Amino acid sequence: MVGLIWAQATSGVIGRGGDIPWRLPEDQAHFREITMGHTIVMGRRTWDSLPAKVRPLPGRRNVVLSRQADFMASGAEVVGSLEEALTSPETWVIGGGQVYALALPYATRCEVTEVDIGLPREAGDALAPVLDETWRGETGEWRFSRSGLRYRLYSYHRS
Numbered sequence: 095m096v097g098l099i100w101a102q103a104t105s106g107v108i109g110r111g112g113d114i115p116w117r118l119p120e121d122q123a124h125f126r127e128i129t130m131g132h133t134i135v136m137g138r139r140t141w142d143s144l145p146a147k148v149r150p151l152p153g154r155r156n157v158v159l160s161r162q163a164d165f166m167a168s169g170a171e172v173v174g175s176l177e178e179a180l181t182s183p184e185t186w187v188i189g190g191g192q193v194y195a196l197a198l199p200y201a202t203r204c205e206v207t208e209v210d211i212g213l214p215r216e217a218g219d220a221l222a223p224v225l226d227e228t229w230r231g232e233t234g235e236w237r238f239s240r241s242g243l244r245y246r247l248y249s250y251h252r253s
C-alpha cells in the first residue's frame with residue numbers, strides 16, 4: 095500500500111524558504127499517528143534538512159531516495175530508484191515536492207492536512223501534488239488548533 099502524507103495551505107503551498115510556513119502541533123501529532131510502525135520514504139534533500147537528533151524518524155523504517163551512491167544516512171536505507179523504495183507492506187511518502195510527484199502514480203491513499211491560511215503561491219514555494227477525479231473519501235470537519243489556526247484532514251483512497 096503506497097500512501098502520501100502532506101500538509102498544505104488552501105492554495106497548495108507546502109513549503110516556503112524550505113519551511114512549512116505555519117505552526118500546527120496538532121498536524122505533527124497526526125503525522126506521527128499515520129506513519130508510526132510503517133515505512134516512510136523521503137527525498138535526500140528532505141533528509142539533509144532535518145536536525146541530526148530528529149532523523150531517522152523513530153519507530154518507522156526510514157528510506158531515503160538519492161542519486162549519490164556514497165550518501166550516508168545514519169539509521170536509514172538509501173535507494174537509487176522509486177521502485178525499490180516501495181516494497182514494504184505499507185509505505186508513506188513524506189516529502190518533498192519532487193518525491194511526491196514521482197510517487198503519486200503509485201499511491202492508493204492520501205492523508206492531507208489542509209490549513210485554512212491564505213498564502214498565495216509565490217516564487218520559490220513548494221507545491222502539493224494535485225488530487226484528480228480518481229480519488230474518493232472523507233474531507234473531515236474544520237477544527238481550530240490551540241492557537242486558533244483552522245485545519246481539516248482529508249483521507250482519500252483509490253484502486
Ligand SMILES: Nc1ncnc2c1ncn2[C@@H]1O[C@H](COP(=O)(O)OP(=O)(O)O)[C@@H](O)[C@H]1OP(=O)(O)O
Pocket residue numbers: 136137138139140141159160161162165173174175176189190191192193194196
Ligand atoms: N527517481 C529518483 N531516484 C533517486 N533519487 C531521487 C529520485 N528523485 C529524486 N531523488 C532524490 O531526492 C532529492 C529530492 O529530494 P526532495 O524531494 O526531498 O527535494 P525537494 O524538496 O527540493 O522537492 C533529489 O535531489 C535526489 O537526491 P540527490 O540530490 O541526493 O541525488
Ligand SMILES: COc1cc(Cc2cnc(N)nc2N)cc(OC)c1OC
Pocket residue numbers: 099100101121122124125126136140141144148151187188189206207
Ligand atoms: C521529513 O520528515 C518530516 C516531514 C514532515 C512534513 C509533514 C508535515 N505534516 C504532514 N501532515 N505531512 C508531512 N509529510 C513532518 C515531520 O515531522 C512532523 C517529519 O519528521 C521530521
